[PDB]
Amino acid sequence: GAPATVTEQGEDITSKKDRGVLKIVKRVGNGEETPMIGDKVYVHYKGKLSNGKKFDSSHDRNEPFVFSLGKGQVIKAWDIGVATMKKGEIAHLLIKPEYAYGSAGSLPKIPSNATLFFEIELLDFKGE
Ligand SMILES: COc1cc2cc(OC)c1OCCCOC[C@H](C)OC(=O)[C@@H]1CCCCN1C(=O)[C@H]2C1CCCCC1
């Protein structure tokens, strides 16, 4: 399913081209503008370990998830991934540990060397 499809078909959006962050656009957004570093950004997301064994959702917060892009308030893969997205876009990301929680992990939620998958919808972004 979705994680495997990203492995097979997703675009490598890393600078290093190390396949650390792979993307598929699932639904196209509007306009040509993507957010600049420092923009305040608004998303809905569904995430899980690639194993599929934990599953987490903004909808469980019954509210959008808000953060400032490229300020390291989220894992590297989101700073990288959301920067590529247009308002209204929905994308799938598959993320090696180097762009997420690394060999240290983040217990108890995230084991060492975890690959993560997300479906993200970019709702809006606004200048600081
Ligand atoms: C590692 O701790 C969590 C990870 C995630 C959800 C959590 O609670 C809802 C977590 O604990 C408390 C909040 C800390 O926030 C971490 C950081 C901001 O999160 C991130 O960068 C990324 C991307 C933004 C949404 C949250 N996300 C996560 O890694 C989730 C993961 C939970 C389990 C499946 C994969 C997503």
UniProtKB/Swiss-Prot annotation:
This is Peptidyl-prolyl cis-trans isomerase FKBP5. Immunophilin protein with PPIase and co-chaperone activities. Component of unligated steroid receptors heterocomplexes through interaction with heat-shock protein 90 (HSP90). Plays a role in the intracellular trafficking of heterooligomeric forms of steroid hormone receptors maintaining the complex into the cytoplasm when unliganded. Acts as a regulator of Akt/AKT1 activity by promoting the interaction between Akt/AKT1 and PHLPP1, thereby enhancing dephosphorylation and subsequent activation of Akt/AKT1. Residues 30-118 form the PPIase FKBP-type domain. Part of a heteromultimeric cytoplasmic complex with HSP90AA1, HSPA1A/HSPA1B and steroid receptors. Upon ligand binding dissociates from the complex and FKBP4 takes its place. Interacts with functionally mature heterooligomeric progesterone receptor complexes along with HSP90 and TEBP. Interacts with NR3C1. Interacts with Akt/AKT1 and PHLPP1; enhancing dephosphorylation and subsequent activation of Akt/AKT1. Interacts with IFI44L; this interaction modulates the kinase activity of IKBKB and IKBKE. Interacts with IKBKB and IKBKE. Widely expressed, enriched in testis compared to other tissues. It is found in: Cytoplasm; Nucleus. The modification N6-acetyllysine is found at K16. Induction: By androgen. It comes from Homo sapiens (Human). Acetylation impairs ability to promote interaction between Akt/AKT1 and PHLPP1. Deacetylation by SIRT7 promotes interaction between Akt/AKT1 and PHLPP1, leading to suppress Akt/AKT1 activation. Ubiquitinated, leading to degradation in a proteasome-dependent manner. Deubiquitinated by USP49, leading to stabilization.
